[PDB]
Amino acid sequence: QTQQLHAAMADTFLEHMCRLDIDSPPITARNTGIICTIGPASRSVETLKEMIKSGMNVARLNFSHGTHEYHAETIKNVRTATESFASDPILYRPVAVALDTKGPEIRTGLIKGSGTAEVELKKGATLKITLDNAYMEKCDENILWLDYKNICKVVEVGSKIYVDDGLISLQVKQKGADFLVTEVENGGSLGSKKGVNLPGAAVDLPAVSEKDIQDLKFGVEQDVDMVFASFIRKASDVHEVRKVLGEKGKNIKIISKIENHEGVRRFDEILEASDGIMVARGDLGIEIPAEKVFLAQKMMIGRCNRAGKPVICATQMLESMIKKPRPTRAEGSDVANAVLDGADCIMLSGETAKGDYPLEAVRMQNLIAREAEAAIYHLQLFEELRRLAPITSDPTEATAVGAVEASFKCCSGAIIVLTKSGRSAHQVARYRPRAPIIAVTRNPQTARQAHLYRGIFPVLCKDPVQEAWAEDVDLRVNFAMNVGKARGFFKKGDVVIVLTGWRPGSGFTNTMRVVPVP
Amino acid sequence: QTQQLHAAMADTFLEHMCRLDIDSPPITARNTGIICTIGPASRSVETLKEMIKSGMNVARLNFSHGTHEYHAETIKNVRTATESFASDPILYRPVAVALDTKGPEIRTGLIKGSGTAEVELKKGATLKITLDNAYMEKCDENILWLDYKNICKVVEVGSKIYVDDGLISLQVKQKGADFLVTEVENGGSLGSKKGVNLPGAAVDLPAVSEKDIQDLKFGVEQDVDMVFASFIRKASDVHEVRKVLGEKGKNIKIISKIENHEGVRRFDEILEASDGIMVARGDLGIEIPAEKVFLAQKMMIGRCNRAGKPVICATQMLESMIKKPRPTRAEGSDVANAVLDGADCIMLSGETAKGDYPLEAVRMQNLIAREAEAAIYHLQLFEELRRLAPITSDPTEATAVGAVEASFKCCSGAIIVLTKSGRSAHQVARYRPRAPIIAVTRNPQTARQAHLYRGIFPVLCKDPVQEAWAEDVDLRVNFAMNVGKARGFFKKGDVVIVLTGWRPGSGFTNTMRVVPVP
Amino acid sequence: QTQQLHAAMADTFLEHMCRLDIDSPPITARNTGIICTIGPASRSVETLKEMIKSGMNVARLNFSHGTHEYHAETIKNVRTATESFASDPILYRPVAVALDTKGPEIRTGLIKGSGTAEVELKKGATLKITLDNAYMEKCDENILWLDYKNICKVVEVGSKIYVDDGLISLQVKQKGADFLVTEVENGGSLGSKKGVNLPGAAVDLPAVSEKDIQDLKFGVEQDVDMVFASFIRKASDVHEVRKVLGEKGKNIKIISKIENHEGVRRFDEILEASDGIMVARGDLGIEIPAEKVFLAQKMMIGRCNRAGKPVICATQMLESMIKKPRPTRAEGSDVANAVLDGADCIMLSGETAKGDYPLEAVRMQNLIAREAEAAIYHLQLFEELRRLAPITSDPTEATAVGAVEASFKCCSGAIIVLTKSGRSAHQVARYRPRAPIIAVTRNPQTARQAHLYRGIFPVLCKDPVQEAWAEDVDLRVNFAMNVGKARGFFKKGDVVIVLTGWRPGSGFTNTMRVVPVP
Ligand SMILES: O=P(O)(O)OC[C@H]1O[C@](O)(COP(=O)(O)O)[C@@H](O)[C@@H]1O
Ligand SMILES: O=P(O)(O)OC[C@H]1O[C@](O)(COP(=O)(O)O)[C@@H](O)[C@@H]1O
Ligand SMILES: O=P(O)(O)OC[C@H]1O[C@](O)(COP(=O)(O)O)[C@@H](O)[C@@H]1O
Ligand SMILES: O=C([O-])C(=O)[O-]
Ligand SMILES: O=C([O-])C(=O)[O-]
Ligand SMILES: O=C([O-])C(=O)[O-]
Ligand SMILES: [K+]
Ligand SMILES: [K+]
Ligand SMILES: [K+]
Ligand SMILES: [Mg+2]
Ligand SMILES: [Mg+2]
Ligand SMILES: [Mg+2]
Secondary structure: OOOOHHHHOOOOHHHHHHHOOOOOOOOOOOOOEEEEEOOOOOOOHHHHHHHHHHOOOEEEEEOOOOOHHHHHHHHHHHHHHHHOOOOOOOOOOOOEEEEEOOOOOOEEOOEOOOOOOOEEOOOOOEEEEEOOHHHOOOEEOOEEEEOOOOHHHHOOOOOEEEEOOOOEEEEEEEEOOOEEEEEEOOOOEEOOOOEEEOOOOOOOOOOOOHHHHHHHHHHHHHOOOEEEEOOOOOHHHHHHHHHHHOOOOOOOEEEEEEOOHHHHHOHHHHHHHOOEEEEEHHHHHHHOOHHHHHHHHHHHHHHHHHHOOOEEEEOOOOHHHHOOOOOOHHHHHHHHHHHHHOOOEEEEOHHHHOOOOHHHHHHHHHHHHHHHHHHOOHHHHHHHHHHHOOOOOOHHHHHHHHHHHHHHHOOOOOEEEEOOOOHHHHHHHOOOOOOOEEEEEOOHHHHHHHHHOOOEEEEEOOOOOOOOHHHHHHHHHHHHHHHHHHOOOOOOOOEEEEEEEOOOOOOOEEEEEEEEOO | OOOOHHHHOOOOHHHHHHHOOOOOOOOOOOOOEEEEEOOOOOOOHHHHHHHHHHOOOEEEEEOOOOOHHHHHHHHHHHHHHHHOOOOOOOOOOOOEEEEEOOOOOOEEOOEOOOOOOOEEEOOOOEEEEEOOHHHOOOEOOOEEEEOOOOHHHHOOOOOEEEEOOOOEEEEEEEEOOOEEEEEEOOOEEEOOOOEEEOOOOOOOOOOOOHHHHHHHHHHHHOOOOEEEEOOOOOHHHHHHHHHHHOOOOOOOEEEEEEOOHHHHHOHHHHHHHOOEEEEEHHHHHHHOOHHHHHHHHHHHHHHHHHHOOOEEEEOOOOHHHHOOOOOOHHHHHHHHHHHHHOOOEEEEOHHHHOOOOHHHHHHHHHHHHHHHHHHOOHHHHHHHHHHHOOOOOOHHHHHHHHHHHHHHHOOOOOEEEEOOOOHHHHHHHOOOOOOOEEEEEOOHHHHHHHHHOOOEEEEEOOOOOOOOHHHHHHHHHHHHHHHHHHOOOOOOOOEEEEEEEOOOOOOOEEEEEEEEOO | OOOOHHHHOOOOHHHHHHHOOOOOOOOOOOOOEEEEEOOOOOOOHHHHHHHHHHOOOEEEEEOOOOOHHHHHHHHHHHHHHHHOOOOOOOOOOOOEEEEEOOOOOEEEOOEOOOOOOOEEEOOOOEEEEEOOHHHOOOEOOOEEEEOOOOHHHHOOOOOEEEEOOOOEEEEEEEEOOOEEEEEEEEOEEEOOOOEEEOOOOOOOOOOOOHHHHHHHHHHHHHOOOEEEEOOOOOHHHHHHHHHHHOOOOOOOEEEEEEOOHHHHHOHHHHHHHOOEEEEEHHHHHHHOOHHHHHHHHHHHHHHHHHHOOOEEEEOOOOHHHHOOOOOOHHHHHHHHHHHHHOOOEEEEOHHHHOOOOHHHHHHHHHHHHHHHHHHOOHHHHHHHHHHOOOOOOOHHHHHHHHHHHHHHHOOOOOEEEEOOOOHHHHHHHOOOOOOOEEEEEOOHHHHHHHHHOOOEEEEEOOOOOOOOHHHHHHHHHHHHHHHHHHOOOOOOOOEEEEEEEOOOOOOOEEEEEEEEOO
16 A cells, blocks of 8 residues: 555544554655755756756745845756756746845844954853944954844843844843943854844834845846745735735735744734745744744644645755755654645755755655655545635636545546646645646746645646647647656556636636546 | 633634644643753753753663763762752652663774764765774774674675764675675765664664673663663564563563664564653664654554553754754754654753753753643544543543543643552553643652653652551642642642542552542 | 444444444433323323333323312322332332423313214315304304404414314414304314414413413422423513422422424523423424424424433324324334434323323333434534533533543443432433433432433432441442342443542532442
8 A cells, every 4th residue: 555545544633643654655746845945056057957856846046145146147047957858848847936035134244354254252241232334344242233223222121132043142231322232142153144133022124125125126027936025024014015016026926924923923914915925934933932933833834724825834944954965853854744734835945055965955855745745634634624615606616626526536646727827726736635736737927836836736838729729628638648647647547637617718617527547 | 822722622623723822821731751861961960950950851871872880870960960859749850760772783983093083985985894803993984894793694785884873875886705895875974983774684683682681680770760672673572671671670661662664564563562662763764764754753653642652752853952052943843743743752862962052952842842732632632542442341441531531621730640550640641631640659660650651740759658548548639739739730729630549559540539729 | 232332333423323233232221211191091090100110200290181189189199109119219210290381372162062072174164263252162063162362363364273283274264353264274073172273373372371370389389390381482481480480499490392483483592591491392393384393303402412401302202102002113213313312301192191002102112212322323422512511610510521431431330420409410411421320319309300311310318317428428329339230220240430529518529430339
């Protein structure tokens, strides 16, 4: 028995667990999207080709660093690498491009001139925070300059301040009108231009900064597929991003990053206004007690799953692999549990942006995700999603649920879906079938954006439109049939589910057929 | 909302998840036992006191290193630290001592010229493995001496050999009588005396070596509470440890460590013969594919939960804390998910034996475990444990289940249980009540051993025996009542469940009372 | 296999059904209370003794017939028969007395000449209804006198009028001053003083008339155990009855009878004000469409089960047995489904009051009830009762649920409960254990009223209160022990549950012990 089907038949979750079998191999298709941050270790066209081969579906560009020229080149390399595979539509894997905004970050100045300079702070020692730009290049164990000008207006005595991924901490002892005297909690090696967090402090920086305005315009110019908006705190923050992207960027998806307490508190507002969510655990785990992160993570994945909107689990998933070729046991666990929680996508940051083993990190996420997907208790999941979904008389929705139910009944090799905008394939995915969803579209952007959804394997048909619509439909269904055969998802004998519409244009999916693979 | 009680009332697991609230604080009681490995960083009487204050419940001695003299002094320090709190029975926290065997380990020799300054192994290079003792202290990038004399008999050309927590990988290119020429796959730095794994080979080292026998007997002499037996592969290995402990060590608990494929395959047989299980993920994630570990972990926790036997999740849970004062997000997640999976105890190894932040590591596990315990979906868990639990005409079992049912009905502050051997408390714990189980005993060994079970807070009553048994029982009940108040588990008005028996001696628990706190 | 235990282990309700076995004999104990209407056929002391031996637990006196002098003698006979078994407390069975009011009913007058005389009513013929007392004793096929003075003011032309258990239907053609010219739709023999129904009409008779007031005070004077209040339409009707019973009758249980559309619509407020409910289907099935009666029945049993208040399924359950010694297949099915629905008691009216086979009808209800009780799917029922069980801190409640859970765990022979007011035993029965609840009391009225609750086998202890309270408790527990053994509920080696308190007086039940039967 493969893909944990024995465990799949358990009548209780406990027995389901008891039945998980390390000797029960998973299927070929991996449903969870893998998002990779591109940087120095993975920027080349050559390495990008291997990233794609290893499993990358989305390339994330972090705009909290780098110039527009730098990112434009990275994007150009991503596309060169992605199109080197275009000559064979059957095997071509679309790759999306995501712009991750700097957003309202607070950073520090330069250490002793050299940007590569590092001052090792002494615990218990003191430290003065300067807002005097004269020191924005003069940083050492005694004077530290920040980006945030209104810092004194929101911080008090006793308050803590974290620097560099929240490792170096500080306690505000003396508050001035433009200065801060603090004592090191647990210092260490302090480099320059590091991230600073002010937990509990209501930072007043702008939802969309000047830099962010520049970057978003650039995103539109570069034709990015999505924007990961940093530090979203409320629905109005998302709306600002939306309005700034405006008309020209109207089809760009906005993924709100939840990384502070206010974002968690106002999560429902944010999700309603967003196209999807990212559980940005780096800042989140500095912003709120590290021990409460898993709670916020499971809450958000659960709500996104309930809403049918994409949710990404991010940050430090395979951290140790920045230096080692194998992950720690906690990391293998974290990736598997993010998938079991229900995340549509999992992400890599420093692991692929700058680490020594970018390809190994991608391959490991592919490996763990696939094993975890087979371990999902679909019996309970499908039942709860069905019962918890709003009641409606939308023909497409009824067709979507019937196809997933039919797919479980016959253990189909796939659910083939023709879609222009991606919507019909999204409706199927929210029900979480075990079988992969081959989404056939002629729209290159829907093909790339589809990766945000668990189980959707976007396929881009390049065939000219046949004059006879019925033949044009069969041509795309056969194209999917060919893809499934070439990819090892299924074979000639197998049974597959096929979703199509009654007429041309979006919004008319209403036909479900159980067909054998030709 | 407190202790995630809003999420607690969800009618589905998905909505349960949707309700997890980072602003819903947990109770004061932390149910999951914390096992700490003692070493250079935590050996002193003074830091051991903080270890205990920080949450350590069990001190683990790793016999893969050190002499009997060394370990006896560790044991003495643990007891000194533990008894420095004995003057106040109401606040005294029993601390167990666990002996973790070396078992059938394979280790490399010493690096030459600098017995630690590592040699660099590069992918593609060649490295010869020798058994010629002339090289046992002259290992380098070209020749590596190993511990296992029959290694050449169980490996073949093409076999894979892993070194140092499986971070270094080699492939046998040529086989010799007393050597192997290999090619390096995953390279890295090689230090001295590192662990070696031969996945897929049938290593013939005895499960219990002569050294293991010496150590086990030493464990009996030193009055240890439990043994963590390394590399258990089948029930007969367990029986062998049992025999070595013999009559004098008959009350010492045997926890079989599962760390190779065979252990997983014969798990049921091993579980039946053992007192409990350790999911020893270090070796397990080298022995089987890293991406399959979470499957084996959930299978074992689920099965031991079904059997009512203790299970320990171990290794690399807060790894990065060996060097940093704060854990990665994957580690925070790992500890939380182990508890949610149902692990009775969690463990620290390098984090407490040698890291720079042992105290912080202990405190973090305490914090995460308590948050995760509140997030458990008891509604489904208790229901499934009941249905799956073997029906029986056993009075004590019926009393235990009724007490847990009653604790949920009146949200009791605790279930107080008088126990001589610990059995009555173990029987309550297997049903997983939300309320803590205060186990009152006069037996010091059962007070220490009780820590292996989720939710049991052992309290050692020193009061002399009353002539009138009824009064002696009431005296012990009031003691529990006092511990709970001083510990902040409940107040004078609260309601608590209390279990007692019909006559003195073990095995007569049959009385359940719902009593208000005095 | 016995008492459908195989079916009990079923994981789904459908499989539970599939496993029901006509060859799995049930236990001796019958849980559903049997309420019998006393009349000419069952009024003699000699026949009453047999009724009790056959299974009667409650004697119902229908006050819409007979004088106070007549009922007082019936009550006297019921008590003479009941006490004839008093010389042996171990086998003595308490028998309750219920007073069922006439309430706002409408009846015709006497048929010409004789009082047994009847007239033939042909379909299509016309019949005139008069209110002119000159004809109240001259009723015949041409003129029918009724006792509802405002009838002409609440009815219209075309209105339907039913006579004699809704078997004769009349349609109003001409609405006269103090008469009605009607057309017979369904013919049949008309007798004297038959019940009349005006479905749809807003009959304005008093909830509690002057005669009902007198009968209710008579009930108090006669020391009846409960009142079955006819035609309750709202909470204020119940309050009126309570006020009439008043301070002296404050302990008499009020069971509101739901038999009209309004009582069903305002059911929740009626239940809150009442002690129990009776699903009075005779009138109900005339007042509302016959095809909807089962909906009202299952809604009421469900809501009563939810609130933990007694519910009686009544009327025409074994109708054909008024004339035949065996019931129809529909009747056997009806009794069984009333029990499966969750009815605390089932009732007999004409079958025992005037039928030719009173004893056989009682025996049949006993036989069917016992078979059905074993066929209940307790696995789902108990789980749902708990899930829906309110959140409280009452110790007695937590003890009751704990005892029921424990009874399922060890398949106990019984749950023995010492109770003064009966409340503690009521609390156990609301959770619907499979095991019988032997309620031991010294209070004769509580022993009598306990029959309203499914599963409570009331037992009246006559022994004098022992000096020492502990021995008095043990004395009462041992008494229940003797009862269970004498009646074949259990035997010496059996395990049973025992519930007692920590001090005399009501409201202190808090102790549960699992013990073998002496
Ligand atoms: O998912 P979307 O955007 O609603 O598209 C699904 C639509 O595509 C179809 O398969 C039609 O395809 P085309 O317009 O591409 O020929 C419809 O029949 C269906 O309404
Ligand atoms: O859990 P165990 O080992 O069975 O001990 C519970 C036993 O302890 C008791 O409370 C008796 O206590 P002492 O024998 O008084 O410690 C019994 O009544 C009960 O049988
Ligand atoms: O069900 P009730 O009316 O609350 O009675 C149960 C009560 O009876 C008891 O068994 C006491 O019995 P007695 O008062 O008749 O001696 C208590 O201990 C208990 O509180
Ligand atoms: O920005 C992020 O991705 C984070 O903080 O984790
Ligand atoms: O031995 C251990 O604890 C392991 O291998 O994880
Ligand atoms: O009154 C009743 O009992 C009825 O109408 O069924
Ligand atoms: K950010
Ligand atoms: K080991
Ligand atoms: K009637
Ligand atoms: Mg950013
Ligand atoms: Mg060891
Ligand atoms: Mg009546």
